[PDB]
Amino acid sequence: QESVKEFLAKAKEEFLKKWESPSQNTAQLDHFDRIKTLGTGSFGRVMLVKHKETGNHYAMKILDKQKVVKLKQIEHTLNEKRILQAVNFPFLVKLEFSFKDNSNLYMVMEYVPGGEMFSHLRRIGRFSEPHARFYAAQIVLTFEYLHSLDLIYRDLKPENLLIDQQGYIQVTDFGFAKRVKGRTWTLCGTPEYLAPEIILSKGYNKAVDWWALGVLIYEMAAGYPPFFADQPIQIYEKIVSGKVRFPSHFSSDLKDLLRNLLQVDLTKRFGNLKNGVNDIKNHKWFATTDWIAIYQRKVEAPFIPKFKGPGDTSNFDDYEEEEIRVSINEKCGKEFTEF
Ligand SMILES: Cc1ccc(S(=O)(=O)N[C@@H]2CO[C@H](CO)[C@H]2O)cc1
Structure with missing residues (x-):
C-alpha cells in the first residue's frame, strides 16, 4: 500500500x-473547423471539431455565458474548467485547450469516437x-x-x-x-x-x-x-x-x-x-x-x-445543426473573469 x-x-x-x-486562453475558435453537433443541453453543446493546422479532432464543449448566468451555473462552470485543467488520470477525458470570447466559454477535450x-x-x-x-x-x-x-x-x-x-x-x-x-x-x-x-x-x-x-x-x-x-x-x-x-x-x-x-x-x-x-x-x-x-x-x-477512425461520428446521435455565433459585444465578462 x-x-x-x-x-x-x-x-x-x-x-x-x-x-x-490554472491555464487560460490556450486556443481560439477560428483555429478549428466545425464538424458535427454531438450533444446539446440547456446552456451548451458539444461539437466535434478539427484543428485546422494539425488535423486533430476534438470534442469542444461550448457554453453560452448568458445562459450559464440565467440557469445559475456560474460556479459550476468555473469548477468544471478549473478541475479539468488540473486533473490527469487514465480514465478521465483530457482537456486540451480552453478559451472564451464575447459570447461563449470553450473547453476543447480529446474526442472519444466509441460513443x-x-x-x-x-x-x-x-x-x-x-x-x-x-x-x-x-x-x-x-x-x-x-x-x-x-x-x-x-x-x-x-x-x-x-x-x-x-x-x-x-x-x-x-x-x-x-x-x-x-x-x-x-x-x-x-x-x-x-x-x-x-x-x-x-x-x-x-x-x-x-x-x-x-x-x-x-x-x-x-x-x-x-x-x-x-x-x-x-x-x-x-x-x-x-x-x-x-x-x-x-x-x-x-x-x-x-x-x-x-x-x-x-x-x-x-x-x-x-x-x-x-x-x-x-x-x-x-x-x-x-x-x-x-x-x-x-x-x-x-x-x-x-468505428472507422478518429473522425467517425457513427456512435453518436443526430442533432439539429445550429449556429455558434460570437457577439460583437462582450457578455458577462465579470462573471467569467477567471475562466
Ligand atoms: C460459475 C460462475 C461464473 C461466473 C459468474 S459471474 O457472476 O461472473 N457471471 C454470472 C454468470 O452469468 C451471469 C451474467 O454475467 C452472472 O450471474 C457466476 C458463476
Missing part, C-alpha cells in the same frame, strides 16, 4: 500545482457481470483518485462514460464536479443516480459518488436502474426508501456489494467507512480484478466499439 499512498501523494501534488495556477456507454448498454440490453466489473473497476479507481484530491464528481451515469478505442472508459462532463473538504449542499445530478442525502437536502460528501456507483453497477448488470419510476417524485420516494429488488440472475456477490453501496445511511455506505475504497476493492465481487492491470490498461476489454 505504500506504493499506492505514494502514487496518490504525487497525484495530489501535481493537481494542486495546476489548481493554484457513450449508454448507447452500448441500451443496444445490448445488459452487460454480463465480467463486462460490468471491468467498467466498474475503472470508476472505482477514478473515484479513488478524485476523492483523494478532495473532488466530488456528482454526475455518474452511463451517458457520461465514453468508450475509447481500446474499450476503456473515459469519464466526461465535469459540470457538477467540485473541490469539497467536508460537505456541500447543491441539488444537482440526474434523478435516478441521486443519493438519499441529496434528495433530503442534507449537507453531503463524497459518499454520494459511491451511491451513484451502486446505481451504475446495478443498471449495467440489470439493464435498468434500481429506483426506476415514471416521474422524479416517484424515483425520489423509492431512493429514500432504499428498497431494492435484485434480478435473480445477479450473483450473490453482486447483491452483497450493491446492498453496501446502495446503503441509505451514508455513515454505513461502502466507500465511506474507515477502510475507504478498500472495502470496495477487496469485496468478493472484485476478487478476479487485478487493480494494477486495469490502471495500466493491460486487461483486454470485453468490447471494442466499431
Whole structure:
C-alpha cells in the first residue's frame, strides 16, 4: 500500500500545482473547423471539431455565458474548467485547450469516437457481470483518485462514460464536479443516480459518488436502474426508501456489494467507512480484478466499439445543426473573469 499512498501523494501534488495556477486562453475558435453537433443541453453543446493546422479532432464543449448566468451555473462552470485543467488520470477525458470570447466559454477535450456507454448498454440490453466489473473497476479507481484530491464528481451515469478505442472508459462532463473538504449542499445530478442525502437536502460528501456507483453497477448488470419510476417524485420516494429488488440472475456477490453501496445511511455506505475504497476493492465481487492491470490498461476489454477512425461520428446521435455565433459585444465578462 505504500506504493499506492505514494502514487496518490504525487497525484495530489501535481493537481494542486495546476489548481493554484490554472491555464487560460490556450486556443481560439477560428483555429478549428466545425464538424458535427454531438450533444446539446440547456446552456451548451458539444461539437466535434478539427484543428485546422494539425488535423486533430476534438470534442469542444461550448457554453453560452448568458445562459450559464440565467440557469445559475456560474460556479459550476468555473469548477468544471478549473478541475479539468488540473486533473490527469487514465480514465478521465483530457482537456486540451480552453478559451472564451464575447459570447461563449470553450473547453476543447480529446474526442472519444466509441460513443457513450449508454448507447452500448441500451443496444445490448445488459452487460454480463465480467463486462460490468471491468467498467466498474475503472470508476472505482477514478473515484479513488478524485476523492483523494478532495473532488466530488456528482454526475455518474452511463451517458457520461465514453468508450475509447481500446474499450476503456473515459469519464466526461465535469459540470457538477467540485473541490469539497467536508460537505456541500447543491441539488444537482440526474434523478435516478441521486443519493438519499441529496434528495433530503442534507449537507453531503463524497459518499454520494459511491451511491451513484451502486446505481451504475446495478443498471449495467440489470439493464435498468434500481429506483426506476415514471416521474422524479416517484424515483425520489423509492431512493429514500432504499428498497431494492435484485434480478435473480445477479450473483450473490453482486447483491452483497450493491446492498453496501446502495446503503441509505451514508455513515454505513461502502466507500465511506474507515477502510475507504478498500472495502470496495477487496469485496468478493472484485476478487478476479487485478487493480494494477486495469490502471495500466493491460486487461483486454470485453468490447471494442466499431468505428472507422478518429473522425467517425457513427456512435453518436443526430442533432439539429445550429449556429455558434460570437457577439460583437462582450457578455458577462465579470462573471467569467477567471475562466
Ligand atoms: C460459475 C460462475 C461464473 C461466473 C459468474 S459471474 O457472476 O461472473 N457471471 C454470472 C454468470 O452469468 C451471469 C451474467 O454475467 C452472472 O450471474 C457466476 C458463476
